[PDB]
Amino acid sequence: PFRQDSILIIYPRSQTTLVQFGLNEETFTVPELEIPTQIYRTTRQDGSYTYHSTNKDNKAELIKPIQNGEIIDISAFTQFLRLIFVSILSDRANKNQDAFEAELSNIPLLLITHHSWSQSDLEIITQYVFESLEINNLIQLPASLAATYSMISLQNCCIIDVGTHHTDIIPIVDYAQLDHLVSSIPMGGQSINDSLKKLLPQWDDDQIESLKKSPIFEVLSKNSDLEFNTFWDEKGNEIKVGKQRFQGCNNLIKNISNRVGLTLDNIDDINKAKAVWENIIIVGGTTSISGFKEALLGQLLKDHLIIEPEEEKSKREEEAKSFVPTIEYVQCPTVIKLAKYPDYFPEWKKSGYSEIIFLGAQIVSKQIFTHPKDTFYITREKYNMKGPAALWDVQF
Amino acid sequence: IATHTNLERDEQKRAEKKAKERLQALKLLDQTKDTRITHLLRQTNAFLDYYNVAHRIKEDIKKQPSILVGGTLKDYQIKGLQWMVSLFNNHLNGILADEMGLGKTIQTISLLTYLYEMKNIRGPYLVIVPLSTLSNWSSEFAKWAPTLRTISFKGSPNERKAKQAKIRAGEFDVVLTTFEYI
Amino acid sequence: TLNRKCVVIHNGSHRTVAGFSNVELPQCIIPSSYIKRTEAEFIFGTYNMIDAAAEKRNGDEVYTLVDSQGLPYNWDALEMQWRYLYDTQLKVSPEELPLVITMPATNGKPDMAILERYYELAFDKLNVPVFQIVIEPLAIALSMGKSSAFVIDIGASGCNVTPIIDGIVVKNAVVRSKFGGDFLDFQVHERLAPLIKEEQKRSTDVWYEASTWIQQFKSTMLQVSEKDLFELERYYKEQADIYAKQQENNPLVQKKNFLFKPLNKTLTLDLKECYQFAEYLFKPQLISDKFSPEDGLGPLMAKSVKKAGASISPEQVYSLLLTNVIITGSTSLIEGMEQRIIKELSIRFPQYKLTTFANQVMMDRKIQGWLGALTMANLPSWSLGKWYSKEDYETLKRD
Amino acid sequence: MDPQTLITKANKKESWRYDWYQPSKEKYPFRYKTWLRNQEDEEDILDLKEFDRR
Ligand SMILES: Nc1ncnc2c1ncn2[C@@H]1O[C@H](COP(=O)(O)OP(=O)(O)O)[C@@H](O)[C@H]1O
Ligand code: BEF
Ligand SMILES: [Mg+2]
């Protein structure tokens, strides 16, 4: 144990699910498999359910198991995992045919979880992985920790994970996710869309979405020099736009910031707190919008930095006209910083770090699965003894 | 963190081998002058004519520190005094290349007494000398200035047990020790 | 160990802590209060309330769940809170798992009436399978490897002093001070009032301010002086005169700076004014002329030990208690607090040697009550605690 | 091949249920759900490449 060919990482999210089977060994590659997170559920007279990849003869209903990051249908969710897992087996079993003795003989699974999943959901998933998929080794890695492990392993930090309809805020102290501080706001990328609809009434949804995803949309805090600029439709249609391309991100940025502030203010050990504020981690699709992260930082500074009020400072400098020492405050944060990205994953640098949580998982899985110690995953041994409850003896 | 460091080292080697071939194929020591002057900036700001850029923080005073008592003031330990103080303000080390008889003891006494006559920190600070002259250095720490205590180390382990057993909590201005006792 | 997983709930008078017995920290710490926003409607949770509070909307009002006894007094609201916890935080039917909850030490009287209201809530309403009730000072002490201990809990409602001898709680020596965290909030506010402009029904703003800047101020400005402050002052003065006179620094003149966000304004206190707030916990006769020095924490601790010596030698109980002093509670984390509680105890009992114990980890004392219940829930035998079942209720219901 | 048999041939043994349990000292009066071990007696495929990015 274990073959690197064999490591399987799954990262399921509301819209899609990133998947990878086998680690490259030279450098880590950005996940190439992206499967929409949904399954079809046919209902068979007599009550029971059947699950397919396609609307079978238009008889099945379309189930979207994960919504706003939460599992809303645990059965369709497990069926969706099986569907992924089986597909991978078939694919490899064709290509190579000796696969069941090699690449498919011992498949350890790392499943990236979301803060919102029940213990009940996590146990059921564990049961499913050991009983239905007949897999033997499982790590359930929280998304937040994947984040901090990718980010050159930070003991103290805050994860701001911007989704489409919600943003999660998750403080990590001493490599532990602080559950009672964790929260999400019902606000994300779509907010930008919505802000823009108000600013550009005569546009439609696809036009607005296209602007957001275009080279000329940025958050300010040379394109910025031009009054108007140009970009092209999804359907090739050229669209011109004024100052609106520097708008629409503000309401979201303010909401996130207000939340970050209330959160970090409830970290009880001020020495931990100082560290967290100095390692803000921002992740998610939205964050690839040029200027966004820096704009968000800018706002956290504007709202939360402990520093002398400018008027007060200006008086003191007039007074000294007749050198001014720095006023020291008892509060934190006096320093706010974004955590430093690792620049030595070439493939990741190339594609941006909106999905860096996955790199977290590539690193953890290699660590854990290419070393003897079985301290951080459930094994068959353990499953046989405690069952799904085995899960809680290997939490991080 | 350590894993990361190794991933980073490996990448750096990989990239370096790549660039090295790429740059030489299709498809004298004054680097120490300018580079070690910018490196002087590296010590000054980044660590904390060479007569100027290295000495950039300037000062001179021909008056002794007020703690020095019972001594005559000549010209040499002035220029040497604020010379080493010039090494102090810039956060720089140094070596004294002088002949002999110029009073290294004087420059250390007036050094600490002037510097931390200003800042008042005055400790903990370490001085180490040959056992051949030890109580001497304490004798110039006696008549040439009071108010800065001294921790010596001599003799059997018992006297030491008294000394670092009393000062075990680490309160003192200066420790005067010798070679093998570190 | 046992094949079970419990829900552990602690309803303090200020904070409510909830989570499962299988992990080291609680899933949630939320306020033991709620906003009633008006068709009525009930808001629970730290961010939900702070958001709603900042909206500054009329008709919004904060109400509490736990009285100063540390006991629930609004049981219709308590159910809504429990529902909220089970639905949105633990996310599990209350019918599945055993429940472990806390009560504060009492003199014994309110006990039966409470137990009944819990039956009604746990059984009639929620359909909980079975529950245990642990006594907070007792569990905290056990969680700390101690069977006998003098447990000094400084929370929001005041100080709660509880001697515990050989696993048993001495009820007549149970003592609850009236001055603690919430009191400190009031004083910080009244004192700073003129620098911040400011100088029930207005519960919403009182609450929001207590939960925001006032909370930060307490954690960063206040300190407890080691020795009676009036004496410290006379001394520091008497010394200061001599340094001055002698030639031709009084520590109380150090300044402390707090950035007050709502007005982007610096508030500076000298160290004395910082020491002053907690002095009230020790000498409450310094606010009103209506408080005796005996309502102060020092006399109170003493009172409770002496009432322990009356069991049912004294200079033995005294010796037991004083070698197992436990200091606990959110407010006990204010810098200087342990030492003053100790100095205050040591001088009322000079013949004895005090040894005190305290969780030094910031988080863990704020929730040490919940931590205590947690370590009860992980006890290896079902016989280690009284576990009330639907039965017990049935049988009490008879005549 | 048959997905179920693919699952069966890879990675080469108990089963648990989540059910009512009633502890004993004989038996305590109460129940609670837990993960109990069972006694002796107790669809499709998708094509990657569509989902591969290109
Ligand atoms: N201004 C002075 N007046 C009198 N004696 C001096 C003066 N400056 C130095 N000395 C003599 O120099 C000696 C100290 O020099 P020392 O510290 O041994 O120099 P180095 O360490 O460079 O050999 C003392 O014994 C002292 O008598
Ligand atoms: F002053 Be020299 F070191 F004899
Ligand atoms: Mg010499």
Q: Which of C292, C323, C339 is the last residue of a domain?
A: C292
| Ligand 1 in reach of B74 Cβ (< 6 A) | yes
CA distance D34 to chain A (A): 9
CA-to-CA distance for C165 and A381, rounded, in angstroms?
Answer: 44
Span from the CA of B96 to the centroid of ligand 2 (angstroms): 13
Fold exhibited by the domain A1-142+341-395? Nucleotidyltransferase; domain 5 (3.30.420)
Its sign, for the CA torsion A144, A148, A149, A150, is: positive
Q: Could C27 and A120 be called an inter-chain contact, meaning their C-beta atoms sit closer than 8 Å?
A: no
A152: nearest CB among B1, B11, B12? B1
Instruction: Report the DSSP pairing between strands A280-283 and A157-162.
Output: parallel
Q: In this structure, what CATH number is given to the domain that contains residue C310?
A: 3.30.420.40
Residues of A in contact with D14 (CB under 8 A): 383-384, 387
Ligand nearest to the CA of B99: 1
D48: nearest CB among A51, A82, A91? A91
CA-to-CA distance for A335 and A301, rounded, in angstroms?
Answer: 9
- E strands, A211-266, are 229-232, 238-241
CA-to-CA distance for C295 and C285, rounded, in angstroms?
Answer: 8
Report the nearest-CA residue for atom 1 of ligand 2.
B101
- Which 3 state secondary structure label does DSSP give A321? coil
CA-to-CA distance for C175 and C260, rounded, in angstroms?
Answer: 37
Bridge partners of D27?
A: D24
| Ligand 1 in reach of B97 Cβ (< 6 A) | no
Q: Tell me which residue range forms the domain holding C335.
A: 137-178+293-368
Calculate the alpha carbon distances from A389 to A135, A158, B14, B123, C91 in Å. 17, 29, 44, 58, 17
- Which 3 state secondary structure label does DSSP give A347? helix
**Chains near C, with 3+ CB pairs < 8 A?**
A, D
Residue with tokens 């010379």: B83
B12 touches chain A (CB under 8 A): yes
Calculate the alpha carbon distances from B22 to A305, A343, A346, B12 in Å. 46, 21, 17, 15
Given ligand 1 and candidates B68, B98, B104, B106, which is best to mutate, with the most ligand atoms within 8 Å of its CB?
A: B106
Span from the CA of B100 to the centroid of ligand 1 (angstroms): 9
CA-to-CA distance for C24 and C377, rounded, in angstroms?
Answer: 12
CA-to-CA distance for A306 and C265, rounded, in angstroms?
Answer: 11
Residue C9 backbone class (left: φ over 0; alpha: ψ -120 to 50; beta: rest): beta
Indicate whether C3 and C129 sit together in one domain. Answer: yes
Residue C397 backbone class (left: φ over 0; alpha: ψ -120 to 50; beta: rest): alpha
Binding residues of B for ATP, by number, are 98-105
Residues of D in contact with A388 (CB under 8 A): 16, 18, 35
The tokens describing A25, both together, are 């060994």
Indicate whether C172 and C252 sit together in one domain. Answer: no
- Which 3 state secondary structure label does DSSP give B125? strand
- Searching chain C, which residue's CA lies closest to the CA of residue A259? C47
Indicate whether C109 and C240 sit together in one domain. Answer: no
Task: Give the burial class of C377: count Cβ atoms within 10 A of its Cβ; 0-12 exposed, 13-18 middle, 19 or more buried.
Answer: buried
Q: Could C50 and A331 be called an inter-chain contact, meaning their C-beta atoms sit closer than 8 Å?
A: no
Chain A contacts in chain B segment 14-33 (CB below 8 A): 15
Q: Which residues of D10-31 are buried (b: 16+ CB within 10 A; e: fewer)?
A: bbeeeebebeeeebeeeebebb
CA distance B145 to chain A (A): 33
The tokens describing C163, both together, are 């001697």
Q: Could B7 and A367 be called an inter-chain contact, meaning their C-beta atoms sit closer than 8 Å?
A: no
CA-to-CA distance for C71 and C113, rounded, in angstroms?
Answer: 11
- Searching chain B, which residue's CA lies closest to the CA of residue A347? B11
CA distance B18 to chain A (A): 13
Instruction: Report the DSSP pairing between strands C265-270 and C255-260.
Output: antiparallel
Q: How far, rounded to the nearest angstrom, does the alpha carbon of residue B167 sit from its chain's CA centroid? A: 24
Secondary structure of chain A: what % helix, strand, coil (to 5)?
Answer: 40, 20, 40
The tokens describing C394, both together, are 């049935």
- E strands, C37-193, are 42-43, 61-64, 99-103, 130-135, 149-154, 159-165, 168-169, 175-176
The tokens describing B25, both together, are 């194929």
Indicate whether C310 and C384 sit together in one domain. Answer: no
**A1-142+341-395 against A143-188+250-340: fold identical:** yes
Indicate whether C170 and C263 sit together in one domain. Answer: no
| Ligand 2 in reach of B182 Cβ (< 6 A) | no
CA-to-CA distance for C311 and C309, rounded, in angstroms?
Answer: 5
Q: Could A344 and B3 be called an inter-chain contact, meaning their C-beta atoms sit closer than 8 Å?
A: no
Span from the CA of B155 to the centroid of ligand 2 (angstroms): 24
CA distance B161 to chain A (A): 37
**Chains near B, with 3+ CB pairs < 8 A?**
A
The A39-43 sheet, strands edge to edge: A49-52, A39-43, A61-63
Backbone angles phi, psi at B64, to 5 degrees: -75, 160
Q: Which of C292, C320, C342 is the last residue of a domain?
A: C292
CA-to-CA distance for A311 and A263, rounded, in angstroms?
Answer: 28
Secondary structure of chain C: what % helix, strand, coil (to 5)?
Answer: 45, 20, 35
Residue with tokens 């007074």: A319
D27 touches chain A (CB under 8 A): no
| Ligand 2 in reach of B100 Cβ (< 6 A) | yes
Span from the CA of B121 to the centroid of ligand 1 (angstroms): 26
- Searching chain D, which residue's CA lies closest to the CA of residue A132? D7
Indicate whether C129 and C1 sit together in one domain. Answer: yes
Indicate whether C169 and C300 sit together in one domain. Answer: yes
Given ligand 2 and candidates B96, B99, B100, B139, which is best to mutate, with the most ligand atoms within 8 Å of its CB?
A: B100
Asked whether the beta carbons of A221 and A164 are under 8 A apart, the reply is no
Span from the CA of B59 to the centroid of ligand 3 (angstroms): 26
Alpha helices in C248-313 (DSSP H): 271-282, 297-306
CA distance D39 to chain A (A): 13
Task: Compute the radius of gyration of chain C from its Cα atoms.
Answer: 23
Asked whether the beta carbons of A3 and A100 are under 8 A apart, the reply is no
Resolution of the entry in angstroms: 9.0
Size of the A and B interface in Cβ pairs below 8 Å: 20
Residues of B in contact with A345 (CB under 8 A): 7, 11
Crossing angle for the helix pair C46-54 and C203-211, to the nearest 10 degrees: 120
Asked whether the beta carbons of C18 and C89 are under 8 A apart, the reply is yes
Indicate whether C335 and C389 sit together in one domain. Answer: no
Instruction: Report the DSSP pairing between strands A39-43 and A229-232.
Output: unpaired
How many helical (H) and strand (E) elements, i.e. helices and strands, does chain D have?
1, 2
Look up the CATH number of domain A143-188+250-340: 3.30.420.40
CA-to-CA distance for C226 and C338, rounded, in angstroms?
Answer: 9
- Which 3 state secondary structure label does DSSP give D18? strand
CB atoms within 10 A of CB B170: 8
Q: Could A328 and C363 be called an inter-chain contact, meaning their C-beta atoms sit closer than 8 Å?
A: no
Indicate whether C301 and C248 sit together in one domain. Answer: no
Q: Could B8 and A344 be called an inter-chain contact, meaning their C-beta atoms sit closer than 8 Å?
A: yes
D29 touches chain C (CB under 8 A): yes
Number of domains in chain C: 3
